[PDB]
Amino acid sequence: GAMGSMERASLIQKAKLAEQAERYEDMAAFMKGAVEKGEELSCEERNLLSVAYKNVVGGQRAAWRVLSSIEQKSNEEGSEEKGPEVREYREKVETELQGVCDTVLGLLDSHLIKEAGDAESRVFYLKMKGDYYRYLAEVATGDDKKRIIDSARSAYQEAMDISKKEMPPTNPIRLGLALNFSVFHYEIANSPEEAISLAKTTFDEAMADLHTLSEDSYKDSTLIMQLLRDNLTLWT
């Protein structure tokens, strides 16, 4: 690995600089290097890792959707034949996206998840595993599509089970997991009723626990609760 010669602390420092510079590819590479040092990550370091890859893959997904839409329109009736280029370039972006997903899943499997014993760390990594299988599912069309979908579901479900046992209903990690698993149900699993039920129940159980929180914790939890409400509004 090209980051093998750099100090762990320097990689983390540079990840923070890259974030400030909106250099998310660099940020991700620095954080990959840091993970590969083999030590567990702190809370802050998990945030940096997840922010970096979310931004990289987010850009790739947005691009893939633009290209997929153009490709779909090219395959309608009355559309002029423009040759293989749109498919080829969509495939190029797709392959790059799959590569990033495989990289993140690789870090989780080797060996972040197996060393994560605290609820916060284990739920966070399992949520990430669900997310990156979900992104693979978004672009999947082959023999393995059902297995990819099931891999996302399984990771999210394990995270949910731990979160419900070990974390309060307002915990931002528990909330963010539920938000994303709800989207999985709606967009990937063709289960809009499950998506809506999950978002509603999550929101309501969080609402009832807000009274226990400080002002700062209240702000953190309510931000994510608003996202749940936003999705419910979109879906109902």
């Binding site: 938000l179 989207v183 709606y186 996202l227």
Partner: peptide, 5 residues
């Protein structure tokens, strides 16, 4: 697209 974090 729906919100995710």
């Amino acid at each position: 697209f729906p919100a995710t974090v």
